[PDB]
């Protein structure tokens, strides 16, 4: 019962039950 995002993953921002506002992939930390 632990969700650890310490490796490549997909994330999606959205309206509760609406359209997808964004969608990306987290591959590297890219110290911005």
């Amino acid at each position: 019962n632990e969700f650890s995002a310490d490796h490549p993953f997909i994330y999606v921002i959205r309206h509760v039950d609406g359209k997808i506002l964004f969608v990306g992939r987290y591959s590297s930390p890219t110290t911005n």
Binding site: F3, D6, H7, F9, I10, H15, F22, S27, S28
Partner: protein, 300 residues
């Protein structure tokens, strides 16, 4: 998702962040003006919904279409685009700095230089969409737990990173088990009506087969199967920026008679207008308090 699939497919192993609405926003403009094959071939991405200058709690959008100062446009096309059209001199140096500024102000200075190299003097028209998003987590990550956790850029390449964490809470989780790999999917809601649904492959290297299977049907399906569960969360606080040219992607997706001279934008102008580039620049910032995101795209 197919455009994402496409973009993500070309740059494997690299951060990618796009905004389907922003993109679909301009494609819809182009559609209104398109005619013949270009039209139907572009209809596949038409949505008058987010193709406006709306807002729903923490997400605001903006549309703008600039035409060649010399061309003459159709009234009907102008009717649809409505309050989002102007005739500009492209050869005019200032013009570019005029546009960028508009997008700059609008996206809280997040997507500043929307346009790079001076805008080609031959460009016939320029369709643009800008979007901004910022909301706080309904459940602000515990600042007194953000420590450094190792991250697997690859099974071998290790790189520490800031890890946001929170325990004792319940979130809509789910443990999908598909033939293309197994993953967990969770929902971190923001205050309002929007949330972030993260898809984390169970194995440290199965993301690929998963991503190449990401469809709106699937995503919707997996999202529904989610139930209120108790899980401890560890998500990296990150901040990235992107710059993509969707001409390549879109063409492979079927849009062949859309860019270049073959493009038929007859229902838009008596003149022979064309668009050769689709620019999409983006910005996101995720931390233990809020999430600020924004993006802008233009069909040069």
């Amino acid at each position: 998702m197919d455009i994402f699939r496409e973009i993500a497919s070309s740059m494997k192993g690299e951060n990618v962040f796009i905004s389907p609405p922003s993109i679909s926003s301009v494609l819809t403009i182009l559609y209104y003006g398109a005619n013949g094959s270009t039209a139907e071939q572009l209809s596949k991405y038409v949505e008058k919904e987010a193709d406006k200058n709306k807002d729903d709690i923490s997400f605001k959008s903006m549309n703008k279409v600039y035409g060649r100062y010399s061309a003459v446009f159709k009234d009907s096309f102008l009717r649809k685009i409505g309050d989002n059209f102007q005739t500009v001199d492209f050869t005019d140096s200032r013009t570019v700095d005029a546009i960028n500024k508009s997008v700059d102000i609008f996206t809280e200075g997040k997507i500043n230089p929307l346009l790079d190299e001076p805008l080609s003097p031959d460009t016939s028209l320029l369709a643009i969409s800008a979007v901004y998003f910022k909301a706080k987590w309904l459940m602000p990550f515990e600042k007194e737990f953000t420590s450094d956790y190792p991250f697997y850029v690859s099974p071998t390449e290790m790189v520490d990173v800031s890890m946001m964490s929170m325990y004792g809470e319940a979130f809509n989780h789910a443990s999908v088990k598909e033939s293309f790999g197994n993953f967990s999917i969770i929902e971190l809601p923001y205050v309002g009506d929007t949330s972030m649904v993260v898809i984390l492959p169970d194995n440290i290297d199965g993301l690929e087969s998963i991503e190449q299977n990401l469809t709106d049907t699937n995503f919707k399906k997996w999202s529904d199967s989610m139930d209120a569960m108790f899980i401890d969360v560890h998500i990296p606080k990150f901040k990235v920026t992107g710059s993509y040219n969707l001409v390549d992607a879109l063409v492979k997706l079927g849009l062949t008679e859309v860019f270049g001279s073959t493009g038929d934008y007859s229902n838009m102008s008596n003149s022979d207008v064309s668009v050769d580039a689709m620019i999409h620049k983006t910005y996101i910032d995720v931390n233990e308090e809020y999430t600020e995101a924004a993006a802008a795209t233009s069909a040069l």
